[PDB]
Design a protein around this nucleic acid. Structure first.
Ligand SMILES: [Mg+2]
Ligand SMILES: [Mg+2]
Ligand SMILES: [Mg+2]
Ligand SMILES: [Mg+2]
Ligand SMILES: [Mg+2]
Ligand SMILES: [Mg+2]
Ligand SMILES: [Mg+2]
Ligand SMILES: [Mg+2]
Ligand SMILES: [Mg+2]
Ligand SMILES: [Mg+2]
Ligand SMILES: [Mg+2]
Ligand SMILES: [Mg+2]
Ligand SMILES: [Mg+2]
Ligand SMILES: [Mg+2]
Ligand SMILES: [Mg+2]
Ligand SMILES: [Mg+2]
Ligand SMILES: [Mg+2]
Ligand SMILES: [Mg+2]
Ligand SMILES: [Mg+2]
Ligand SMILES: [Mg+2]
Ligand SMILES: [Mg+2]
Ligand SMILES: [Mg+2]
Ligand SMILES: [Mg+2]
Ligand SMILES: [Mg+2]
Ligand SMILES: [Mg+2]
Ligand SMILES: [Mg+2]
Ligand SMILES: [Mg+2]
Ligand SMILES: [Mg+2]
Lengths: 99, 70, 102, 46, 63
RNA sequence: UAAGGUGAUAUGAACCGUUAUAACCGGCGAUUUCCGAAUGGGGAAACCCAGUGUGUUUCGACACACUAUCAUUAACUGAAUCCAUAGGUUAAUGAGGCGAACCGGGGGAACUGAAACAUCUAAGUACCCCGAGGAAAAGAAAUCAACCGAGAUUCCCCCAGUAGCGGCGAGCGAACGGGGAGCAGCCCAGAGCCUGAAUCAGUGUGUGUGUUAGUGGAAGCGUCUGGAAAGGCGCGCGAUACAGGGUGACAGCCCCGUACACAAAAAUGCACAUGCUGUGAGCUCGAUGAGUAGGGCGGGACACGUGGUAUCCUGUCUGAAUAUGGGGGGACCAUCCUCCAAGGCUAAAUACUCCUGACUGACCGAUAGUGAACCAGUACCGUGAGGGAAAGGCGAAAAGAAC
RNA sequence: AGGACCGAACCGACUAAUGUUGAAAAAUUAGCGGAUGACUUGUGGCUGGGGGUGAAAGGCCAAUCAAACCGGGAGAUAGCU
RNA sequence: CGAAGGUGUGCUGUGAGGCAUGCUGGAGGUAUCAGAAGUGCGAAUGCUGACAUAAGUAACGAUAAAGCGGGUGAAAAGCCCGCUCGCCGGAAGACCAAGGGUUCCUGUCCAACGUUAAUCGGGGCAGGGUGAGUCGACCCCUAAGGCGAGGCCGAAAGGCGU
RNA sequence: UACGGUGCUGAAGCAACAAAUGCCCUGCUUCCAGGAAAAGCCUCUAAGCAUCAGGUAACAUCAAAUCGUACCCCAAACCGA
């Protein structure tokens, strides 16, 4: 039976921060934040295939949250996830970046 | 403890010193267990005494039938 | 209890006005009812990221909900809602006395 | 001195935490005494 | 497809708004709302659309 | 059903809609991650791990489906021992958990009262536990009555706080009989004649109604005061509707409604009417409920504390008659009268309220009324079971105060 | 070798002062006893209320113990204030 | 052309009270007679809330005391920079477990919280921040002990255990 | 230089003696109170396999998933309001 894999929508937009781009200077390793049940192995192909990148090995994290918006009582968590991929210096992407 | 045939057990009663007391008591019956069926092999069972007789009265074999439909 | 479609030259049985006709309306079931029948004045503070102050305050979505008589070729009043055969059937869409649509 | 309490989150649930509750007879009731009877948002942990 | 327009063939092909028909949503996915130019209609009409077609399958197939 | 919409704090944005297919309301269906009986093993609930299949496969392997225990049956196996059982495997069926009161069953306190306290009381109550239903339970005389007779069970009124029971103290406390609500009676203990008609269970359908959205539904002005008219005054109209609520104050005629009349693709409660399946019926001749009835001993239940105590039940030991036989008629005996135990089924009046709709109250109106009118069983407190608050009001409308 | 000896860590608490609405619901300061042993300590487990545990004081069983805490019978009873 | 309630005044009754009325208030209130009651508090070491008193008194948490020059700022004894000074150093240093659960870093703001001031903070609001084939948990293994097919017991619940 | 810090460059880099409660030491000696278990690991065979599969070694390559990781940690982040 076909593998219920979100062949495409495993991730979402890239994180983006100070570590962002500066991380890219390292090995063209960019972040992007994937969904919880990701498993690096599912990420590798996710980025390389369809999105044409030809990466190799990842990292991935988790991270929670917790705040308080309104006055009293109202609070929560939120969770999230991280990723770093890699992208060998050889197989580039004709990078989709600028200023 | 439930006597396979003519099933019985721990009814409760109370005591009586005639003078003062009505402490609750508790009965039981009779343990014991025999029987051996002459229609196959010696199946046994734990039954009361007044429970053994009854079976041995006109059952003994004509009674296993109820345990069938336990 | 919506009593307007694309335009209803209403009146003003009560509300600082006598019989000022109008439009907009937008009366409904869960929403408002706005018409020139009423309007006011007081602008709201605008700190400047951009001057988010176009300026000029008058009516926005002035009050006055239902309970407003709609147009009639003659005087006023003339509560609508009657009902006709066929002719859409998506609503009674008629009028009191003689008429239906304006 | 040593107040009567100390920590340990691994020693607690093994006394309270639905596996500790549901496993015991009257124990399954404890959740009903709250969830069913009462209306506790959530009550069963360390 | 649309509504009744959906009932026609039986190929899962139409059910690929995800592939090369969804990459578009991917771009305008950056919060902090960046991309206000004009008709920035980045509302989910497609994901809600993924069903329907995700449905009907059984209608024809099973229930 | 429709001129308006994408729930709320929540606007903003980007959109969807408008003289026959947005949104919304109702029916049926689709999807329904994970934890939880939890059911593939595991387990500090929401997570760890596995066996057998499957497709794709860019053919790496992965996502999904099934694999809990137990019982009825069936199929296959198969020990000690010839057989034969035991035991193993499989398949289909069903059960398991959760629940407000009411119901039946197993077990069962003390405070307290007796102005102490052991009999007795509280009380078979509180509590624990099992089990079932929309009701349960009970129920068609081995009943009661007195020589006339009544006639299953059930609940209400009364007999009566009587008879009686009782350290005859505390207290407990009937029934006969009478008035009502409501009423059905039948099967097996067995063989023929006929033979699928009575009648039951479940499905099929057809009418008629109930429900789960709805449609229509009446009739106001002018003037004065006012910030605002429903208010004062004057003149009209509807009324099977003048319930109530809303509307810048107090409105039958402004808004919603109100009487009243009408409505369903479908989904169904329930009536009937009959088809199908299972069921059996009517009659002739038969039978006609034994470790039982009684009894000894010990306890319990009867209003009844063993009494002079009947009747019921049973832990223990016994043990009969089979119909001019057997039970009862409150120790017991004779007579007379009454009824047939040791198999079973059964609607109604009766009980309750988690919940749904409608409608009411000489019921409260914010330390009142629910603990909780308000993001309350929340915050907080405690290891835990458990405990458990406070907190409503601008205005008619934001016109929430540009400067 | 040793329930051996002096003595830090560690374990314990004999004395005095201070504190006594404290820094603290038992401590601080200066002394004090044991310190290879019936020693001392981390983690987890097992004993449940008339019950447990006790080198024994009615001691300890979550700042509670001549019968724990929580909920219930319950508005116990109160010839007393 | 101002209801209730709130605060004054006059008259009145034997009294509990009644009436009229000025002011405030922004909507309701109820002769008379009859009726039903959660019908009248100063006390119950009464319940709940609010506000006094002591009193601007005690106290500001180890007696390891700090001085100065700049900076910033509305303001600096306390914050940043600098030089001195003193204190700990089998620690008053460093690392981890337990437990905690964003307290970490940056920017900001100073109401409340800091026993004072606060431009400062473990405070508020934003963002950012924890990257593993070799460390740990999962995972193999079993201890104490737990659970336990069937099974043995036991009114039910349930106890024991292969 | 932003005042914290940054880019570049960069010498010597040895010997002698002195130690441990750390390591050889799951050792050696000795004593009485005579000091877990199971798996991995090595090995031996059973049923079964029976030119096969497997076993050992060398190297080539692929795989090593998923959670945790911030900070306090004899303390202002834990137990004591
Ligand atoms: Mg499972
Ligand atoms: Mg399980
Ligand atoms: Mg007494
Ligand atoms: Mg209508
Ligand atoms: Mg007669
Ligand atoms: Mg209240
Ligand atoms: Mg009030
Ligand atoms: Mg010594
Ligand atoms: Mg000392
Ligand atoms: Mg010493
Ligand atoms: Mg311990
Ligand atoms: Mg204590
Ligand atoms: Mg108590
Ligand atoms: Mg009582
Ligand atoms: Mg009392
Ligand atoms: Mg006092
Ligand atoms: Mg002073
Ligand atoms: Mg003084
Ligand atoms: Mg002084
Ligand atoms: Mg002083
Ligand atoms: Mg200080
Ligand atoms: Mg925070
Ligand atoms: Mg900091
Ligand atoms: Mg902070
Ligand atoms: Mg990681
Ligand atoms: Mg066991
Ligand atoms: Mg770290
Ligand atoms: Mg304290």
């Amino acid at each position: 039976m076909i593998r219920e894999e979100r062949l495409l929508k495993v991730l979402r937009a890239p994180h983006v921060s100070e570590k962002a781009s500066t991380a890219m200077e390292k090995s063209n390793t960019i972040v992007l934040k994937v969904a919880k049940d990701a498993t690096k192995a599912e990420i590798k192909a996710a980025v390389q295939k369809l999105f044409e990148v030809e990466v190799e090995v990842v990292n991935t994290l988790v991270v929670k949250g917790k705040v308080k918006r309104h006055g009293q009582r109202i609070g929560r968590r939120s969770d999230w996830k991280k990723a770093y991929v890699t992208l060998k210096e050889g197989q580039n992407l004709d990078f989709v970046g600028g200023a | 403890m439930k006597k396979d045939i003519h099933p019985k057990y721990e009814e409760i009663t109370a005591s009586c010193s005639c003078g003062n007391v009505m402490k609750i008591r508790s009965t039981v019956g009779h343990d014991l267990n025999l029987d051996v069926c002459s229609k196959c092999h010696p199946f046994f069972t734990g039954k009361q005494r007044d429970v053994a007789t009854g079976g041995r009265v006109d059952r003994f074999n004509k009674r296993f039938n109820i345990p069938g439909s336990k | 209890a919506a009593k307007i479609r694309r335009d209803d030259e209403v009146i003003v049985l009560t509300g600082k006005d006598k019989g000022k006709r109008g439009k907009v309306k937008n009366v409904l079931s869960s929403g408002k009812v706005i018409v020139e029948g009423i309007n006011l004045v007081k602008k709201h503070q605008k700190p400047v990221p951009a001057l988010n102050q176009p300026g000029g305050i008058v009516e926005k979505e002035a009050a006055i909900q239902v309970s407003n008589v709609a147009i009639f070729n003659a005087a006023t009043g003339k509560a609508d809602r009657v009902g006709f055969r066929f002719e859409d059937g998506k609503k009674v869409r008629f009028f009191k006395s003689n008429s239906e649509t304006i | 001195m040593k107040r009567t309490f100390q920590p340990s989150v691994l020693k607690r649930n093994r006394s309270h935490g639905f596996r500790a509750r549901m496993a015991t007879k009257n124990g399954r009731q404890v959740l009903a005494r709250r969830r069913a009877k009462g209306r506790a948002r959530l009550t069963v942990s360390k | 497809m649309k509504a009744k327009e959906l009932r026609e063939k039986s190929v899962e092909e139409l059910n690929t708004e995800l592939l090369n028909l969804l990459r578009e949503q991917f771009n305008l996915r950056m919060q902090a709302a960046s991309g206000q130019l004009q008709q920035s209609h980045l509302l989910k009409q497609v994901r809600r659309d993924v069903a329907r077609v995700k449905t009907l399958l059984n209608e024809k197939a099973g229930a």
